[PDB]
From Swiss-Prot:
EC number(s) given by UniProt: 3.1.27.-
Role description: Preferentially cleaves single-stranded RNA at pyrimidine residues with a 3'flanking guanine. Hydrolyzes poly(U) and poly(C) as substrates, and prefers the former. The S-lectins in frog eggs may be involved in the fertilization and development of the frog embryo. This lectin agglutinates various animal cells, including normal lymphocytes, erythrocytes, and fibroblasts of animal and human origin. It is cytotoxic against several tumor cells.
Cellular component aspect of the GO annotation: extracellular region
Record localization: Secreted
Coiled coil: none
Keywords: Disulfide bond, Endonuclease, Hydrolase, Lectin, Nuclease, Pyrrolidone carboxylic acid, Secreted, Signal
Name listed for the protein in its UniProt record: Oocytes ribonuclease
Lineage: Eukaryota, Metazoa, Chordata, Craniata, Vertebrata
Family to which this protein belongs: Belongs to the pancreatic ribonuclease family.
Disulfide bonds: C19-C71, C34-C81, C52-C96, C93-C110
Residue span relative to the full protein: 24 to 133 of 133
Active site residues per record: H10 (proton acceptor), H103 (proton donor)
Binding-site residues, substrate: K35, R36, V37, N38, T39
Any one of the GO BP annotations: defense response to Gram-positive bacterium
UniProt GO MF annotations: carbohydrate binding; endonuclease activity; nucleic acid binding; RNA nuclease activity
Length: 111
């Protein structure tokens, strides 16, 4: 991956109720129709860069709360995929390469 394209990876800081117009790009689609969970994170990419600071390859997890903005593919009002936006505490597991979060490990619970 890269720091610029990853800038979108964790920092899709869009305070609007339109998760499609913000993710309108070939970098946000799977092999079917739309993604089941377009989880975005609302926070400065550098604060996330501090929690992933350790070595040139590791696994860390934001235990405090990096406030996430998740648009989950639910149902009703298909356009064609309906999304329910909900913001809350972000306890997630990030991965660090080159010391910057180059990959997302997934949810908070990590090994």
């Amino acid at each position: 991956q890269n720091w610029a394209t990853f800038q979108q990876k964790h920092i899709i800081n869009t305070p609007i109720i339109n998760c499609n117009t913000i993710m309108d790009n070939n970098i946000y689609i799977v092999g079917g129709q739309c993604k089941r969970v377009n989880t975005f994170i609302i926070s400065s990419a550098t604060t996330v860069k501090a929690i992933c600071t350790g070595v040139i390859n590791m696994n860390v997890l934001s235990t405090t709360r990096f406030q996430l903005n998740t648009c989950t593919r639910t149902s009703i009002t298909p356009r064609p995929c309906p999304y329910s936006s909900r913001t809350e505490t972000n306890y997630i597991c990030v991965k660090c390469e080159n010391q910057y979060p180059v990959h997302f490990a997934g949810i908070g619970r990590c090994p």
